[PDB]
Write an enzyme that holds these catalytic residues in place. Structure first.
Site, PDB file in Angstrom:
ATOM      1  N   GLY A  11      24.478  68.325 -28.706  1.00 12.43           N
ATOM      2  CA  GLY A  11      25.378  67.174 -28.501  1.00 12.43           C
ATOM      3  C   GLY A  11      24.859  66.090 -27.564  1.00 12.43           C
ATOM      4  O   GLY A  11      24.991  64.910 -27.927  1.00 12.43           O
ATOM      5  N   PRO A  12      24.282  66.385 -26.376  1.00 10.87           N
ATOM      6  CA  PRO A  12      23.866  65.325 -25.451  1.00 10.87           C
ATOM      7  C   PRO A  12      22.768  64.402 -25.996  1.00 10.87           C
ATOM      8  O   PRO A  12      22.834  63.216 -25.727  1.00 10.87           O
ATOM      9  CB  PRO A  12      23.353  66.076 -24.212  1.00 10.87           C
ATOM     10  N   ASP A  13      21.938  64.916 -26.909  1.00 14.17           N
ATOM     11  CA  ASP A  13      20.799  64.121 -27.446  1.00 14.17           C
ATOM     12  C   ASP A  13      21.149  63.401 -28.757  1.00 14.17           C
ATOM     13  O   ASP A  13      21.262  62.160 -28.717  1.00 14.17           O
ATOM     14  CB  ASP A  13      19.564  65.007 -27.632  1.00 14.17           C
ATOM     15  N   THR A  14      21.452  64.116 -29.849  1.00  8.66           N
ATOM     16  CA  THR A  14      21.644  63.414 -31.156  1.00  8.66           C
ATOM     17  C   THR A  14      23.080  63.430 -31.709  1.00  8.66           C
ATOM     18  O   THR A  14      23.232  63.019 -32.873  1.00  8.66           O
ATOM     19  CB  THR A  14      20.718  64.000 -32.229  1.00  8.66           C
ATOM     20  N   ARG A  15      24.094  63.852 -30.946  1.00  9.89           N
ATOM     21  CA  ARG A  15      25.462  63.969 -31.539  1.00  9.89           C
ATOM     22  C   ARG A  15      26.014  62.613 -31.995  1.00  9.89           C
ATOM     23  O   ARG A  15      26.542  62.549 -33.124  1.00  9.89           O
ATOM     24  CB  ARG A  15      26.445  64.581 -30.536  1.00  9.89           C
ATOM     25  N   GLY A  43      36.570  81.297 -23.885  1.00  9.83           N
ATOM     26  CA  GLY A  43      36.108  82.621 -24.244  1.00  9.83           C
ATOM     27  C   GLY A  43      34.589  82.661 -24.314  1.00  9.83           C
ATOM     28  O   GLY A  43      33.901  82.077 -23.467  1.00  9.83           O
ATOM     29  N   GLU A  77      25.081  81.129 -31.564  1.00 15.40           N
ATOM     30  CA  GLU A  77      25.678  80.717 -32.827  1.00 15.40           C
ATOM     31  C   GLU A  77      24.636  80.694 -33.936  1.00 15.40           C
ATOM     32  O   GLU A  77      24.930  81.053 -35.082  1.00 15.40           O
ATOM     33  CB  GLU A  77      26.338  79.349 -32.671  1.00 15.40           C
TER      34      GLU A  77
HETATM   35  N1  ACK Z   1      28.635  72.274 -24.560  1.00 13.48           N
HETATM   36  C1  ACK Z   1      27.951  72.126 -25.690  1.00 13.48           C
HETATM   37  N2  ACK Z   1      26.659  71.722 -25.624  1.00 13.48           N
HETATM   38  C2  ACK Z   1      25.975  71.573 -26.766  1.00 13.48           C
HETATM   39  N3  ACK Z   1      26.374  71.766 -28.019  1.00 13.48           N
HETATM   40  C3  ACK Z   1      27.655  72.166 -28.048  1.00 13.48           C
HETATM   41  C4  ACK Z   1      28.490  72.362 -26.969  1.00 13.48           C
HETATM   42  N4  ACK Z   1      29.744  72.775 -27.403  1.00 13.48           N
HETATM   43  C5  ACK Z   1      29.645  72.817 -28.712  1.00 13.48           C
HETATM   44  N5  ACK Z   1      28.403  72.446 -29.159  1.00 13.48           N
HETATM   45  C6  ACK Z   1      27.934  72.390 -30.538  1.00 13.48           C
HETATM   46  O1  ACK Z   1      29.022  72.094 -31.380  1.00 13.48           O
HETATM   47  C7  ACK Z   1      28.669  72.508 -32.713  1.00 13.48           C
HETATM   48  C8  ACK Z   1      29.919  72.686 -33.542  1.00 13.48           C
HETATM   49  O2  ACK Z   1      29.589  73.186 -34.826  1.00 13.48           O
HETATM   50  C9  ACK Z   1      27.875  73.796 -32.503  1.00 13.48           C
HETATM   51  O3  ACK Z   1      26.664  73.811 -33.266  1.00 13.48           O
HETATM   52  P1  ACK Z   1      25.507  74.471 -32.406  1.00 13.48           P
HETATM   53  O4  ACK Z   1      24.131  74.112 -32.818  1.00 13.48           O
HETATM   54  O5  ACK Z   1      25.558  75.950 -32.374  1.00 13.48           O
HETATM   55  O6  ACK Z   1      26.000  73.784 -31.067  1.00 13.48           O
HETATM   56  C10 ACK Z   1      27.428  73.747 -31.041  1.00 13.48           C
END
Ligand code: ACK
Length: 170
Positions: A11-15, A43, A77
């Protein structure tokens, strides 16, 4: 009514910058694409939201980033993705390397060294070996590399049709 795809990124780079150019473009092919930004922390893993959407998704398409190795939520994940994939190979994975070599993804070296240097002080000594075993396989699947000079635009248009081709012809 359900999801035919499922993304994953940092998220911080390409979201809001790069991944976003793909999502809007994809919706123009009239398909339901799923993207989440929830920072979780409710959780350690949510069965109703992340786990359900995964089993509802059809074409897992992660987007490896430079910092795809630091977030405690992303990797665990990702391990749930490729693991679910190996049971039923009816579905596929189309990774897209981005501003990173396709060499620092199979051996966690290079710019990931610092990441697993500190992550070894909290978790198990077998869970980490599970990630490195799962993260490796992703770096063997087919994937469009994005050169610092490659058009951020055309790559999106081409990668959309390859996703839309597997749907129309079925
Ligand atoms: N705090 C966080 N920092 C970075 N990525 C996050 C964060 N919370 C959630 N995500 C990303 O949100 C996505 C929802 O499908 C999920 O894909 P990911 O690659 O597993 O990273 C997660």
């Amino acid at each position: 009514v359900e999801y035919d795809v499922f993304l994953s990124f940092r998220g911080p780079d390409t979201r809001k910058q790069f991944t976003d150019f793909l999502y809007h473009f994809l919706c123009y092919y009239k398909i339901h694409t799923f993207r989440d930004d929830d920072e979780l922390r409710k959780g350690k893993e949510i069965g109703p939201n992340l786990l359900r959407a995964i089993d509802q998704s059809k074409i897992y398409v992660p987007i490896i980033s430079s910092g795809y190795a630091d977030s405690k939520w992303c990797l665990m994940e990702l391990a749930e993705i490729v693991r679910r994939q190996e049971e039923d190979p009816r579905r596929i994975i189309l990774p897209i390397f981005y501003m990173v070599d396709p060499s620092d993804v199979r051996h966690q070296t290079g710019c990931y060294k610092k990441a697993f240097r500190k992550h070894a002080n909290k978790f198990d000594g077998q869970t980490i070996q599970n990630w490195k075993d799962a993260l490796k396989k992703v770096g063997d699947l087919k994937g469009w590399h994005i050169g610092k000079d490659d058009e951020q635009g055309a790559i999106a248009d081409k990668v959309s049709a390859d996703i839309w081709s597997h749907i129309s012809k079925e």
